[PDB]
Amino acid sequence: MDGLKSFLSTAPVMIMALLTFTAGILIEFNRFYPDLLFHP
Amino acid sequence: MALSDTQILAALVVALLPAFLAFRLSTELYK
Amino acid sequence: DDFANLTPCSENPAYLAKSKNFLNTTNDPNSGKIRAERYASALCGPEGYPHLIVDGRFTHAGDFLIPSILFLYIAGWIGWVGRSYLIEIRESKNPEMQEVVINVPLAIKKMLGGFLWPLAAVGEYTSGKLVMKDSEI
Amino acid sequence: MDGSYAASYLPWILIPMVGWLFPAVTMGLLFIHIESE
Amino acid sequence: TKFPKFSQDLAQDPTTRRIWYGIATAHDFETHDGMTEENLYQKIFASHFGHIAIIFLWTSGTLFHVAWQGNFEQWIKDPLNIRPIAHAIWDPHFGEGAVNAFTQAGASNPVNIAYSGVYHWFYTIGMTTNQELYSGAVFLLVLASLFLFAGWLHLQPKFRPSLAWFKNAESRLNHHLAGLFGVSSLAWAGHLVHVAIPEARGQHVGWDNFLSTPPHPAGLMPFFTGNWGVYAADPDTAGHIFGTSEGAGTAILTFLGGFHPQTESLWLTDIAHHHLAIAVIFIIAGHMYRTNWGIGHSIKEILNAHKGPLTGAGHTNLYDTINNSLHFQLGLALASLGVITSLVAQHMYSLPSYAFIAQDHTTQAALYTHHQYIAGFLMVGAFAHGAIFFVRDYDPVANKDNVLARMLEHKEALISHLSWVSLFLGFHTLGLYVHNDVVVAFGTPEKQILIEPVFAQWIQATSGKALYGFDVLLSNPDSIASTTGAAWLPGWLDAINSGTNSLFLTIGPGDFLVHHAIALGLHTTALILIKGALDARGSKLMPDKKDFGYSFPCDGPGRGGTCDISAWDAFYLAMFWMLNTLGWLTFYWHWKHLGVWSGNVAQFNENSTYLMGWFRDYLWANSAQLINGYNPYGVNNLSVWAWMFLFGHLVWATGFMFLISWRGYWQELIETIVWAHERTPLANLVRWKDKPVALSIVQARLVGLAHFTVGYVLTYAAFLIASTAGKFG
Amino acid sequence: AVPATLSWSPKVAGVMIACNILAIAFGKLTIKQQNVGTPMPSSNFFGGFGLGAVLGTASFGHILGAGVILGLANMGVL
Amino acid sequence: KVSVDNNPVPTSFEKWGKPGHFDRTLARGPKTTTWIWNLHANAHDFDSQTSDLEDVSRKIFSAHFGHLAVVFVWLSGMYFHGAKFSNYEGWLADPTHIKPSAQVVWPIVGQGILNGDVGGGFHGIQITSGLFYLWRASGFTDSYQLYCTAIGGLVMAALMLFAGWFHYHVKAPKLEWFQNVESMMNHHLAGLLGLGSLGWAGHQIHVSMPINKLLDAGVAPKDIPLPHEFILEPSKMAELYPSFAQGLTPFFTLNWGVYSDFLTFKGGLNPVTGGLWLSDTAHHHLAIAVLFIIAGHMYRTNWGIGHSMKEILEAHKGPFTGEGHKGLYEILTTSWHAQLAINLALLGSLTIIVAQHMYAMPPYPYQAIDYATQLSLFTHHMWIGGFLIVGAGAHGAIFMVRDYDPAKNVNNLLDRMLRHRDAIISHLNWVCIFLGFHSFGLYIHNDTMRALGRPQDMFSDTAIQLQPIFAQWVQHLHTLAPGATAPNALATASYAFGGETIAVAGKVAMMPITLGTADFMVHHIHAFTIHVTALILLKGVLYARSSLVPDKANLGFRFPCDGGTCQVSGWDHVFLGLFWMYNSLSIVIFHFSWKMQSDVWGTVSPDGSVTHVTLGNFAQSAITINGWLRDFLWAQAANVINSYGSALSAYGIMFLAGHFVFAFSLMFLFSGRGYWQELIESIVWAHNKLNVAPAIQPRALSIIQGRAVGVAHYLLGGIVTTWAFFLARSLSIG
Numbered sequence A: 001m002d003g004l005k006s007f008l009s010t011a012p013v014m015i016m017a018l019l020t021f022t023a024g025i026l027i028e029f030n031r032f033y034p035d036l037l038f039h040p
Numbered sequence B: 001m002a003l004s005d006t007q008i009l010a011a012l013v014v015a016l017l018p019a020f021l022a023f024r025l026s027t028e029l030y031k
Numbered sequence C: 001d002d003f004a005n006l007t008p009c010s011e012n013p014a015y016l017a018k019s020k021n022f023l024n025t026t027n028d029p030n031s032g033k034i035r036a037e038r039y040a041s042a043l044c045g046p047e048g049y050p051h052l053i054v055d056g057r058f059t060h061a062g063d064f065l066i067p068s069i070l071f072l073y074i075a076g077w078i079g080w081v082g083r084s085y086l087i088e089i090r091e092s093k094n095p096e097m098q099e100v101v102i103n104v105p106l107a108i109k110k111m112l113g114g115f116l117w118p119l120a121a122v123g124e125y126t127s128g129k130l131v132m133k134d135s136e137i
Numbered sequence D: 001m002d003g004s005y006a007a008s009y010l011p012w013i014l015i016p017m018v019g020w021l022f023p024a025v026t027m028g029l030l031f032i033h034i035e036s037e
Numbered sequence E: 001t002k003f004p005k006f007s008q009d010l011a012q013d014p015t016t017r018r019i020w021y022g023i024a025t026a027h028d029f030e031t032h033d034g035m036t037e038e039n040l041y042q043k044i045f046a047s048h049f050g051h052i053a054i055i056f057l058w059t060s061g062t063l064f065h066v067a068w069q070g071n072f073e074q075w076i077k078d079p080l081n082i083r084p085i086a087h088a089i090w091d092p093h094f095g096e097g098a099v100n101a102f103t104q105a106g107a108s109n110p111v112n113i114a115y116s117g118v119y120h121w122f123y124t125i126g127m128t129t130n131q132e133l134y135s136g137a138v139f140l141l142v143l144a145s146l147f148l149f150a151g152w153l154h155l156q157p158k159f160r161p162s163l164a165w166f167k168n169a170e171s172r173l174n175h176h177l178a179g180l181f182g183v184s185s186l187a188w189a190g191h192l193v194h195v196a197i198p199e200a201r202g203q204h205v206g207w208d209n210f211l212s213t214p215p216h217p218a219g220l221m222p223f224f225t226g227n228w229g230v231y232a233a234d235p236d237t238a239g240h241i242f243g244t245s246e247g248a249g250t251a252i253l254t255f256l257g258g259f260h261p262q263t264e265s266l267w268l269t270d271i272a273h274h275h276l277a278i279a280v281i282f283i284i285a286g287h288m289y290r291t292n293w294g295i296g297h298s299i300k301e302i303l304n305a306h307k308g309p310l311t312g313a314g315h316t317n318l319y320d321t322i323n324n325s326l327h328f329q330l331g332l333a334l335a336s337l338g339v340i341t342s343l344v345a346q347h348m349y350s351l352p353s354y355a356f357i358a359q360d361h362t363t364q365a366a367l368y369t370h371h372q373y374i375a376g377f378l379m380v381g382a383f384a385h386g387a388i389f390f391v392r393d394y395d396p397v398a399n400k401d402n403v404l405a406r407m408l409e410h411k412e413a414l415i416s417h418l419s420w421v422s423l424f425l426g427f428h429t430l431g432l433y434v435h436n437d438v439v440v441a442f443g444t445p446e447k448q449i450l451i452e453p454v455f456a457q458w459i460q461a462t463s464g465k466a467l468y469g470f471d472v473l474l475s476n477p478d479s480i481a482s483t484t485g486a487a488w489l490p491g492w493l494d495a496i497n498s499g500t501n502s503l504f505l506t507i508g509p510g511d512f513l514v515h516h517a518i519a520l521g522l523h524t525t526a527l528i529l530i531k532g533a534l535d536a537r538g539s540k541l542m543p544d545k546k547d548f549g550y551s552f553p554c555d556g557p558g559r560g561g562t563c564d565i566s567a568w569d570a571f572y573l574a575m576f577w578m579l580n581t582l583g584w585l586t587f588y589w590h591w592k593h594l595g596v597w598s599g600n601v602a603q604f605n606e607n608s609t610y611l612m613g614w615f616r617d618y619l620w621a622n623s624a625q626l627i628n629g630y631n632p633y634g635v636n637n638l639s640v641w642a643w644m645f646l647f648g649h650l651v652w653a654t655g656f657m658f659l660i661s662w663r664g665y666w667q668e669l670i671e672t673i674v675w676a677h678e679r680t681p682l683a684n685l686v687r688w689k690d691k692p693v694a695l696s697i698v699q700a701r702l703v704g705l706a707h708f709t710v711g712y713v714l715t716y717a718a719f720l721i722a723s724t725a726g727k728f729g
Numbered sequence F: 001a002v003p004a005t006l007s008w009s010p011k012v013a014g015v016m017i018a019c020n021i022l023a024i025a026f027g028k029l030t031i032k033q034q035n036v037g038t039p040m041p042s043s044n045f046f047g048g049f050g051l052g053a054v055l056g057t058a059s060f061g062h063i064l065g066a067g068v069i070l071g072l073a074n075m076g077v078l
Numbered sequence G: 001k002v003s004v005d006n007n008p009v010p011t012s013f014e015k016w017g018k019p020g021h022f023d024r025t026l027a028r029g030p031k032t033t034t035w036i037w038n039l040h041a042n043a044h045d046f047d048s049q050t051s052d053l054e055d056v057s058r059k060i061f062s063a064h065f066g067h068l069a070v071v072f073v074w075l076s077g078m079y080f081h082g083a084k085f086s087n088y089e090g091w092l093a094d095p096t097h098i099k100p101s102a103q104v105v106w107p108i109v110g111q112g113i114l115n116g117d118v119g120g121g122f123h124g125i126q127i128t129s130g131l132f133y134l135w136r137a138s139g140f141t142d143s144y145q146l147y148c149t150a151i152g153g154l155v156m157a158a159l160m161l162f163a164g165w166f167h168y169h170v171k172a173p174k175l176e177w178f179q180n181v182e183s184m185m186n187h188h189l190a191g192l193l194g195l196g197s198l199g200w201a202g203h204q205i206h207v208s209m210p211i212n213k214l215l216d217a218g219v220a221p222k223d224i225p226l227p228h229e230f231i232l233e234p235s236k237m238a239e240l241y242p243s244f245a246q247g248l249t250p251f252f253t254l255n256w257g258v259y260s261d262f263l264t265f266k267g268g269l270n271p272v273t274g275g276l277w278l279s280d281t282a283h284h285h286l287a288i289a290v291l292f293i294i295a296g297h298m299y300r301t302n303w304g305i306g307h308s309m310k311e312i313l314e315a316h317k318g319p320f321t322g323e324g325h326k327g328l329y330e331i332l333t334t335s336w337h338a339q340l341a342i343n344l345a346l347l348g349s350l351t352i353i354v355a356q357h358m359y360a361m362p363p364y365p366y367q368a369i370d371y372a373t374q375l376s377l378f379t380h381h382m383w384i385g386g387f388l389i390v391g392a393g394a395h396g397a398i399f400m401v402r403d404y405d406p407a408k409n410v411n412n413l414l415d416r417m418l419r420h421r422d423a424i425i426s427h428l429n430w431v432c433i434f435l436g437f438h439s440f441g442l443y444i445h446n447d448t449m450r451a452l453g454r455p456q457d458m459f460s461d462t463a464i465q466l467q468p469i470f471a472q473w474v475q476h477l478h479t480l481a482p483g484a485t486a487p488n489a490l491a492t493a494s495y496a497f498g499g500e501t502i503a504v505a506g507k508v509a510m511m512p513i514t515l516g517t518a519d520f521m522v523h524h525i526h527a528f529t530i531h532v533t534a535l536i537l538l539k540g541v542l543y544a545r546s547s548l549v550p551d552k553a554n555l556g557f558r559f560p561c562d563g564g565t566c567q568v569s570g571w572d573h574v575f576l577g578l579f580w581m582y583n584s585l586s587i588v589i590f591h592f593s594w595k596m597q598s599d600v601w602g603t604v605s606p607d608g609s610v611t612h613v614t615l616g617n618f619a620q621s622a623i624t625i626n627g628w629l630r631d632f633l634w635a636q637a638a639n640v641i642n643s644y645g646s647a648l649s650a651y652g653i654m655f656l657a658g659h660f661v662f663a664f665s666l667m668f669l670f671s672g673r674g675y676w677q678e679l680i681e682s683i684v685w686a687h688n689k690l691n692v693a694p695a696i697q698p699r700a701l702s703i704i705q706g707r708a709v710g711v712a713h714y715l716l717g718g719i720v721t722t723w724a725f726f727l728a729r730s731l732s733i734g
Ligand code: CLA
Pocket: E419, E420, E422, E423, E424, E425, E426, E427, E430, E520, E524, E527, E528, E573, E574, E576, E577, G660, G663, G664, G665, G666, G667, G668, G670, G671, G679
């Protein structure tokens, strides 16, 4: 368990997790509110 | 009018002056 | 009249012809129509594409100013929390290992506290904790 | 490849000299001098 | 052994490295064995005489071949339709197809078309016959001879100047400001008034009659009476036909502004008053420094007096630092000349001075590209010799706590901030281009990020351009700047609002993005060059870099960590960015003008906001005629440029070999070749004198950079000329 | 068009047996390691061959028989 | 034979959270950013992690199990997206009017435009992998069958992972098990290749052939019986193939002639589909199976009979080679790198052969007339083969540095090769120079002559001719072979050699590929580039240990320089070899693309006239460099650069993406770490000034890594550029 937790805390897993989470937010926002070129 | 043959040849003769002087300057610089 | 070379999109003949054929960018069948209405408020060139004004006039604050404020808040947040985490682990026995094996409980604490970074940055600057003295490095 | 310009025979002489003799004399003199002593 | 005579160490090298390095260090006089400071200056002074003579001979050739083999007399009768001829072609390798293709411009033999603009230049300054061109060519031969003799003379014992003579900065500045600049400008104004202007009005003025032909009917009495307004009355009318008296005036000095309606170039009378006006300023400026009569300024006093509490010693002791360092002086000269050369390029295309040159599109493109590339090379050289100054001449003690020393103190701040701005520009400029590419690719061009270059448009408005409706200063009729009654304003406002010239071209979002791309190139090239100069004296990686030299061999045992850090390596890297920056700006200039010349400015305006537009509309589209210069169906006049186009591509690629591979691979390969030679019967009898060796690490980078640069220039030159020449005559 | 092949008959059997006999004889004279591994129930009748040698020669015999039978059938000699 | 150790390595997650555990140096943790790069570079260099050959072998054996699991997951995906996100069923019912598509993108930020109309109302990305053609040949008729195959692949992937874990953490074979090369060859010849081909032959006979025969006869896919129905009711098979009425008796009695109705030697191509006759492929795999199974009883394992590979090698020695092949058995049974070097060289060469043979003898139905699939398959497998061959040079050099023991190789072939290495390279050096001058010089000659308006002086069919007479002779023999040297073959092996034009749906599937002066010139360009690439890699292997730089083996395979002595390591030769392999293969695929469009592919008129894609311009244009620039690159790039706003816009984007990465790589290739380290110092100062300097000290990339990064980005940029160029072009011509 401790070894697995440390593995999931390694730099590559963490950055990919954050990028995946960040990508999801941006994609989902553009799925519902697309084409925002400027603040109305 | 177009340049004559003598004018073209005359320029070549005049060009021997800088050629000779260039040789002297280059040799002097080589010293 | 400033921007006389430009024209509002709602009055630009090129925009009107093209805006009727805007492609749908999502699964919503009206997404192309919505974009046509939204961009109608902007200034368009002869080709009919919106142009952005960033000279500072507040009538176009939505072009660059509002996006700029949002980015700087997010950017400063990312930098500030990363700096805070880096400084704190520097006080441990093995700081290097905590940079390649993240201390997730500590990182989450720092990340959740980044919304006050502009105030924290001001406080550190006044307290001499933001900038190191040249003689110190 | 003739020429209506005056003294059109000059290229027949100068270009071979500039193209053949000058490089040949230059290369010969430089290589001999560079490979001397 | 013998060669090089100036380096005993190189002469003793038993390998082929002796030959290469002897050539590469021939003109680095400072490092020659036994060189003294006094002999250094005298050798440089003589060498400068040689360079000036070469320039005159080069100019003499241009005049001679035009007069001999050109069509100048035919061209002047119809400048807008006749193509000027550069020189005849005599190539025995030509086939039947090539002979016919290059028999052009009305010639009876194969010829090349001139794109240097000399025809327009010679015609504008009043030359109208082959005889006049021939006379100028002969005159320059004599002038070249005089300087060749002067160089030889001033190397003789009695005529060698002393070291103190070369160090007399105040005297040289006075003479060269008042005399070299001022009097020359005054003399040119004389040529314009007495020769060029009368010729433009159909009046022949030459050496035979200029003494009996006053340039103005009023004579010189108004000049000495103060009634100078007479020389501006009755200017050339808008209907004047250049070279004839139809519509011609009598004024010799004017301030009309704008362009001559027919020739689409600046008024000669304005140019005359211009060169007269600056001559007065330069002559006055040349009386500032004290030489022999007590009056005047001492440069040392001025520098030592300008110091404040925020810059330590300020400008103290910089007179000695600059006056004693030739590399510092050369750096300043190259930097100043580099800036001026760009200014020439920028202002000659927008404010042409030569009649009908604005309609010779290929010539305009060639001239702008030529001088911008020269400017780029000069700028790199200025920083290179700035770095050399720090390595060789900079004295920390003398410059203690002055502005120069403090630059080295905050170098980390300088380099780090230059790094940020380069990253700042690069990330966001590239990002916007890619954003536009993707949205356009997905069929949604309306989603592009198009930023209006408002600031630049505003500047155009301040000069009177009313297109943008900013209504500011000269664009505002009620502004105090507009109601001054300036003579030039009516002409200038017409020119800037005509829309039929290159004066303040209308700009849009496409111009915005490329201008920031140019800023990226400028800042990044400066970053590389500035880092090299400031780190030349040492860094943390190599604290003792100063005592190794500008370029040092890094292949010695134990010197693995000394590679790529010499100040020379910074120059090597900066060259790529200088070429890249020049490529971006020349692409920008050419593509924009292609639309302006053809009237289809919409193409650049709409397609320059994404990179596929440059790739497709500029590169791919304009290559069609070039690559058809020769094809399975025949050849045309672009065959040479097509062949040169591939030649440049080949030379460029050949450079990759030297830049990518390293010495070790080739040294062992050569050993096998040496092994084969020594064992081949009847061939091992022939023995080399210099042992073949692979190129040194520095040499390979220099050779690779040379092939890269040559291929870079040749490729674009062929494309630039062929694409423009094919479209427009 | 297609090469001729033969429906089975005693003639085919004779060729296959003959080829197997040749393979056995050839193996007995050429195999270097004959009685290695699993032995036979009575090696006297197999010339000292082990199980591997018995199967190897028989397998080689079937291959030779197939080639000969098909080859002779192709030429019509069988 | 079988010998394992029980539970040698406990299964525990402890080392998962300790990166770099496998290396003693890295296990101590990072001090500089160089540690991060070293961790990934040395992850799978097992022999440097442990000195025991048995331990190295065990890691390799289970590692190879992991790779198989990865491949199965990839295969499972292809079948799954074919089952769920494809128009396979629609295409199967109308292959000549529907284009294959098996990838559908989500409609986000306007990328839905990539879902182009491929026919039948389906929208998606058109695939060039040829999966539909493979699946049709296999007998697939409905999505459920593809779905079942996808599930099976995942099960196999799971089994491979379990086997990898089991055979490392539970039951690890001993070294003696791995070194039983005689047994391995027997099993992998007779078992893997033999039974694999026999099993597939049974599949084709019982499944592929009957289903495809009905499909080729115009029977709707839904009306075709399922594969098992032909087995449950053999009368269905008898109707299609009467010989099945006689059962298996003919097989056992050697009366094989009766099976001629489904085991054929037709040759040529199926007129309906334009692919190989499935009856021919069935007899092919049946004949191959017999050959491999026989070949697999060659080596002695446990019953005396068979050859000893060591004995065979030691016997082959001659007067010109001293000890000859003695000692090689020891090398190949104790050095994994030596084995990998051989296998990479042959497998890479094999992949190239696959590309060459598959295009000219299209095995799958409708593959030939899908020019995008034809071009994609040829180009793809050409690149794979080229990379593997370069790997052979890399791991050949690694063997010399690490595993070659001179004391154990005295006067044998390997030792003798190192003795005359100067002679080898010097002569190989000359032939490369000769080929370069007399191959590329011809193009330069032609460019100059054409530019000078002297077409009559060029090397061309209408000018001085260079006819590849030997190749023309071979084509003539292969055209005459049916009935004369292959009497029982009804048609030529490939119509590329000569004969009739095969047209399907009004498009050319294959036709004679004539060879002329342009073909002669380019073929000798290939000889030049291949010889040079071999020179660089062979030189790397021969000079990996010694010189200039003696005792090079001490430094190792990867070292920056010795002590100029930079770019002398075995690795550095791989770095240069990659560039030349890229250069060599780029011309090959360009040769293929232009020749096929110019002289093979096109539309066939009802009367019979053929209109080629580029109207036969190869003969007169491919003889100058300008022709390649103008008629191939500039002309055919029009499709990719005009792709914006269409379903092909993605290729336009990737076309620019490739150009960028190529240019980006030049930053690494032209520079060195010294400059970047000094730049980092100034940047570090700024970070220090704000108390935000990292604990892991930033470092510039090592000298070797900078070269590795440069070549990696260079090849990626160049290959991606061609990929987008080819797919956009081929998807637009038909
Ligand atoms: C197209 C080619 C190319 C590119 C893109 C760059 C880019 C850069 N160079 Mg380089 N350079 C090049 C060619 C190139 N160079 C060549 C041919 C040479 C001659 C040897 C040099 C020599 C050189 C020097 C000497 C210097 C630079 C510097 C720079 C920086 C300039 C600032 C900038 O633009 O920041 C913006 C950054 C970029 C444009 C980089 C690309 C960013 C990408 C597109 C986004 C991130 C991608 C992400 C990581 C995904 C990774 C892939 C995958 C795993 C997902 C930047 C990193 C200077 C520097 O370092 O300044 C700080 C510097 O000193 N370059």
